[PDB]
Scaffold this active site. Sequence first.
Site, PDB file in Angstrom:
ATOM      1  N   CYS A 191       0.208 102.843  66.543  1.00  0.00           N
ATOM      2  CA  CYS A 191      -0.137 103.487  67.817  1.00  0.00           C
ATOM      3  C   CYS A 191      -0.281 102.456  68.942  1.00  0.00           C
ATOM      4  O   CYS A 191      -0.450 102.923  70.106  1.00  0.00           O
ATOM      5  CB  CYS A 191      -1.315 104.411  67.699  1.00  0.00           C
ATOM      6  N   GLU A 243       6.599 105.208  66.066  1.00  0.00           N
ATOM      7  CA  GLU A 243       6.649 104.943  64.627  1.00  0.00           C
ATOM      8  C   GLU A 243       7.388 106.096  63.971  1.00  0.00           C
ATOM      9  O   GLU A 243       7.149 106.319  62.784  1.00  0.00           O
ATOM     10  CB  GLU A 243       5.246 104.664  64.092  1.00  0.00           C
ATOM     11  CG  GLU A 243       4.235 105.794  64.343  1.00  0.00           C
ATOM     12  CD  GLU A 243       2.786 105.444  64.024  1.00  0.00           C
ATOM     13  OE1 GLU A 243       2.357 105.700  62.867  1.00  0.00           O
ATOM     14  OE2 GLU A 243       2.075 104.900  64.903  1.00  0.00           O
ATOM     15  N   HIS A 253      -7.155 104.884  72.881  1.00  0.00           N
ATOM     16  CA  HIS A 253      -6.476 105.501  71.754  1.00  0.00           C
ATOM     17  C   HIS A 253      -7.454 106.455  71.023  1.00  0.00           C
ATOM     18  O   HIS A 253      -8.554 106.030  70.646  1.00  0.00           O
ATOM     19  CB  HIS A 253      -5.869 104.451  70.824  1.00  0.00           C
ATOM     20  CG  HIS A 253      -5.262 105.077  69.619  1.00  0.00           C
ATOM     21  ND1 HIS A 253      -4.235 105.992  69.727  1.00  0.00           N
ATOM     22  CD2 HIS A 253      -5.546 104.976  68.312  1.00  0.00           C
ATOM     23  CE1 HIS A 253      -3.919 106.436  68.533  1.00  0.00           C
ATOM     24  NE2 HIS A 253      -4.669 105.801  67.634  1.00  0.00           N
TER      25      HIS A 253
END
Lengths: 393, 398
Positions: free
Chosen positions: A105, A73, A217
């Site tokens: 993400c 990103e 994550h």
Amino acid sequence: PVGIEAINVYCGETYVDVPTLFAARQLLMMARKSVALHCEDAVSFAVNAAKPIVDALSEEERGRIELLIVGTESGVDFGKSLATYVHDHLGLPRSCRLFETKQACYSGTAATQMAAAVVAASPFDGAKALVISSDVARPVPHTYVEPSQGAGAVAMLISDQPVVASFDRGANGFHSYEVMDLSLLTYIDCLKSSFTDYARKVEGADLVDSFDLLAMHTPFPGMVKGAHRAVLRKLKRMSPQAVEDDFAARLSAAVEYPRQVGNIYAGTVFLALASTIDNAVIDRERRVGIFSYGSGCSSEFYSAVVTPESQRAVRAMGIRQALDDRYELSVPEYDELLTATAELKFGARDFTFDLDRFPQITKARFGGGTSRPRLVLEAVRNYHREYVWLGDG
Amino acid sequence: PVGIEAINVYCGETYVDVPTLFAARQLDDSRIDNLMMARKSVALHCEDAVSFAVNAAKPIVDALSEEERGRIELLIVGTESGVDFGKSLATYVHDHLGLPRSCRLFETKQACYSGTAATQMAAAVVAASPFDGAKALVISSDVARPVPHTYVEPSQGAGAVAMLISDQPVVASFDRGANGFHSYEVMDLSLLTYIDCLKSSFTDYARKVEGADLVDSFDLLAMHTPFPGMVKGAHRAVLRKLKRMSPQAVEDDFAARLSAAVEYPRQVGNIYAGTVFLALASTIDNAVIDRERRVGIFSYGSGCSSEFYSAVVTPESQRAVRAMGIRQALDDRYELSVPEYDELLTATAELKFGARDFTFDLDRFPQITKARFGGGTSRPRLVLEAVRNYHREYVWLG
């Protein structure tokens, strides 16, 4: 059998101590966060992550790389992918698909799963893909998120020789929907619902019994801890102490590198996976449950098998030593780096870096002293990005 | 067996005539014959790549049973018209198509290669799945903002092409593993890079496909069309080098294998991600598909990445695409005067990249929304109505 043949990380050459920044900002379970030099970008992070795993290949093995995807990103153009620059600095053949993936993400996992499908679907044995998760998020001073935000890239070779992690084929649950506070709630909803979707496709899946280890994550380790707790309580109604023990047993190895690096967005779940393999005892075949998330949102729960050969392959990359060699920034040095970094804007036509603006950092690191040479961004000339090898001597 | 189950296009509700625009821009009237462009699609001010993608995909999603729609496990938007560093257009597009939440959502980026990237990834996921019946929705969507007084401007349109990718590939059945690539970083030169990629990606295809010949292997060709003159030049350059054919044989090959593919693109303009897919739909609609025919497909994006691949189309392909009514939808577009076109460009630019708050006046061009966007007998269209704290909000303007 398809998965990760090789993995490496570049989490930059500097860090700031998280409790010190908290205090200095007058405000997680975070210890240190990686900081990018003003002249680093997602491209230069991606090249520094991938170069060791590309250079370790024979000519013949590198010539079978037919896919390079960058998950980010931290893009630099409406159209031009990071993968074009990254390809050009890794000596890859031109007989390669090149593009970028975007979904906060989740971008790295999107790239990895596409690349695994390309390898599995190929009528030819020995197809290889290079997938690189790379982000250089710019922290906003005086936000509670700032001390959780790092810089890093995670490079993976994806092949039918999956030494590092062999993916359970078809064992993929998804949970995605448009959504814009809610941030913990959405993560928890995705962990629970992506796992439930996994269990729908995998007969007898249990979030405790099916996985020896978890990697997820990690916006910050406190978030992973809180989400793990909410989801085990909702799905299994386990006691608080049993949930605490399960976190220590199955997630404490995963959050080790992230708590030394911070959120690197695309690459964080892969850093958690490397951290799991490096920081747990892998005494035989063990299964890892993997949860990938990107806000906005999209999420996936999948699984892979790791072995003692996994542990040996990841240990040989020396991730812990690389993290421990990072230059410690004072909060003032960190603030000057943030200021210098913000000077280059999205859509800038022309921009020239002073590569010697922070001579304290480039003396000690970036080819300084004992340190590895590093690709950095030197200029933008009529929209075209130009990189130099620092420490080429 | 994997490929495109269904295809549809949305090329907006307005157009500007290319010769009329050249004249109003006082561009050299000579180069109209070099572009080979008739007219270009123009986005309304209140349209973006999300709203274009929803308008393209909605008919192919609505035709599915609830059970078929339940098996959509992948939505990829290929675009160079992103709205956010992080948030993919696929999130907004998902929310407006009633797709199940058991779906991967993300965006692909590599200039006009973004759509083919998304398509080939989706094809790989469907082929690789241990379960039969997996579906993916891939949408190529771009709303490039033309720069007035450039020679590029009259070649640039607005368009999205949506494709269901599955193991029931009625529209086009991909030749499995028949894929040549040619990609490298490069920054005018654009004709030279396109030609290098067409020749080299086809050479790579021939390396993997025993006996491949750029003339003998393919009944038809469909290619990324920055403008039809570029395709015609690149076709000529590559057959000159690879086959040493006479100029008349090359001209006749263009007429037979590429004239159908450029028919919709010459009325729409470059729509970046989607243009190769618009060329494929155009080839199916405008050629006689009398039996199984093999199309050679060349996808390209500046910067650069490129792929040469092939698919089989049949009379059932031609019936399925004809039912979408693409030609009638292109012929129904509102004809802009250049001043109306200039006003749409100005109104569009008011919404800046990164804008946090913006509210559209959906009735700002009442002469257009009287006739189109649900006006009169036109079909309803999703449009962008507002950005509220970065969140994009859409209205069904029908």
